Amino acid sequence: MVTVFGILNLTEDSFFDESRRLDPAGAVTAAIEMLRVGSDVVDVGPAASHPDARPVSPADEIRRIAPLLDALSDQMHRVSIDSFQPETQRYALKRGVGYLNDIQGFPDPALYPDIAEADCRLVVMHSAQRTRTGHLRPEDALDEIVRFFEARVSALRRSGVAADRLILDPGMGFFLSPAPETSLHVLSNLQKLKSALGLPLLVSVSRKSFLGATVGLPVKDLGPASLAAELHAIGNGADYVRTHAPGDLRSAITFSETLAKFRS
Amino acid sequence: MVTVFGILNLTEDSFFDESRRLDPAGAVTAAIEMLRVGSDVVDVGPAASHPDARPVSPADEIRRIAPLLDALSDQMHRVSIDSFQPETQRYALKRGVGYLNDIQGFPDPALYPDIAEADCRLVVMHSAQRGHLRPEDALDEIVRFFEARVSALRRSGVAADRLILDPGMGFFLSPAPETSLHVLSNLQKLKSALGLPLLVSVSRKSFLGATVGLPVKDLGPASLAAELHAIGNGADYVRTHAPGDLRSAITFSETLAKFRSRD
Ligand SMILES: Nc1nc2ncc(CO)nc2c(=O)[nH]1
Ligand SMILES: Nc1nc2ncc(CO)nc2c(=O)[nH]1
Ligand SMILES: [Cl-]
Ligand SMILES: [Cl-]
Ligand SMILES: [Cl-]
Ligand SMILES: [Cl-]
Ligand SMILES: [Cl-]
């Protein structure tokens, strides 16, 4: 069984014009449709990853996700909030979203008691931008990721966060290293990571730099390479996938699972 | 190593308007372009596929492909002619195409001595038309079919190393998806039993539509998944509607495999 997270970036190109003004009604419509075809969970991202973007204040993040939580009130369990701001996480916490997705892997223990009371699940992502000899090399990646999760899981578990609420994301692309080889090594040997961690795995390879470096294509021609990467990840222990093309991935999952039933 | 055939259907909706008249210049432009990104080979199909279509005469087939061979004469080894008409096949031989792709599997021996003198390769496709074939009967029938057909080609002088075998997919096997699924799922035994290179064309076929429940133009992703499985199970050639997509997934898969560390 695979659970598909569909990416909803509230600050992507299609949500503003020359007035630099964001469209809340447009995002609500997109999120409803996503949940209708393709996305098991919609992953709402209020922070900008634009090269010139300044940090987004927590208050702006909350104002951006609040209208979306309003429209999805009767299906909170299909909502994930993609944010590293603890105040945004706290706000989404109390409103009862299904998931908190943190690229910093919840490093502030002052938020742990608030998380233990709630029932949401946590996507705990490893980020190698923590520095020793330099960038994360392939031969060290697996041990680094295991030691990272060993420490962060046991910290959350010490504060009352049950283990069955935890989803572990190894990180991909530049979150692992500027070198594509490190992401390729981790993805290819994902099964060994899954066995050593013993908890469900999520990956998000869709449109990442290391795909572009591998096939030599710009970010919007990476749909097919992403699908190949995702199907490979699913076959090697990934239980969750975060992707820009969720309906595409689901229909490929359905074909793969149906085809496996005919193997002799 | 995979060779990707890009489908060029000369009678798809993009190549005619209300004049019911085919546009060869648009197809030439499409062919040159798909060769530039993705397609190792372009599979040129002049025979209609419409539900209300009558058969296409060989003269019309030849008229439709002639401008394409004109535009690709300096790279004929990258050209496959998708036709079952022996007149169209003879014409293509005379202009030295790289491949003859016959969904009837070359059943007319009158053509063999002309093929034997050429140096093209042949895509010999198996079909249930000679229409229900069950999964339990599928593999033995495909093997027995090719054993007779391959021997008959070789005995008329067509060398074995020129042959590419296609099991057929979709309605060429059965109206039910189960037979295509069984054959695709167990493609490796087919390859080892036949011992010749294998081509499959699953792209957009009915059995994908029935498996994922999607119309023919939402089948890109399911097709890519099917294609990647076929490649991992002995397919040396793949005929697809999205050749640039497939080549990019193959490049990623081949690169990823190099990072698998022992056991
Ligand atoms: N869990 C997770 N979330 C992400 N959010 C944003 C981005 C990139 O903007 N990447 C990721 C990712 O790789 N994993
Ligand atoms: N070799 C080959 N050719 C085909 N041409 C047309 C179509 C469908 O129009 N299918 C095939 C196929 O499955 N294999
Ligand atoms: Cl409501
Ligand atoms: Cl999609
Ligand atoms: Cl021989
Ligand atoms: Cl038919
Ligand atoms: Cl093989």
Residue numbers in the entry:
A (entry chain A): 1 to 130, 135 to 268
B (entry chain B): 1 to 130, 138 to 270
What does the report in the manuscript say about this coordinate set?
The sulfonamides (sulfas) are the oldest class of antibacterial drugs and inhibit the bacterial dihydropteroate synthase (DHPS, encoded by folP), through chemical mimicry of its co-substrate p-aminobenzoic acid (pABA). Resistance to sulfa drugs is mediated either by mutations in folP or acquisition of sul genes, which code for sulfa-insensitive, divergent DHPS enzymes. DHPS catalyzes the condensation of para-aminobenzoic acid (pABA) and 6-hydroxymethyl-7,8-dihydropterin pyrophosphate (DHPP), producing 7,8-dihydropteroic acid (7,8-DHP); this compound is further transformed, ultimately leading to tetrahydrofolate, an essential precursor for DNA and RNA synthesis. All three Sul enzymes adopted the (ɑ/β)8 TIM barrel fold also shared by DHPS.
We determined the crystal structure of Sul1 in a ligand-bound state, and the Sul2 and Sul3 enzymes in both apo and ligand-bound forms to resolutions between 1.74 to 2.8 Å. We identified electron density in the active site of Sul1 corresponding only to a pterin ring which we modeled as 6-hydroxymethylpterin (6-HMP). The 6-HMP molecule formed hydrogen bonds with the Sul1 residues Asn101, Asp173 and Lys212. Additionally, the plane of the pterin ring formed van der Waals interactions with Phe179 and Ile103. We noticed that the Phe residue that is conserved across Sul enzymes (Phe178 in Sul1, Phe179 in Sul2 and Phe177 in Sul3) and localized to the active site adopted different rotamer conformations depending on ligand binding.
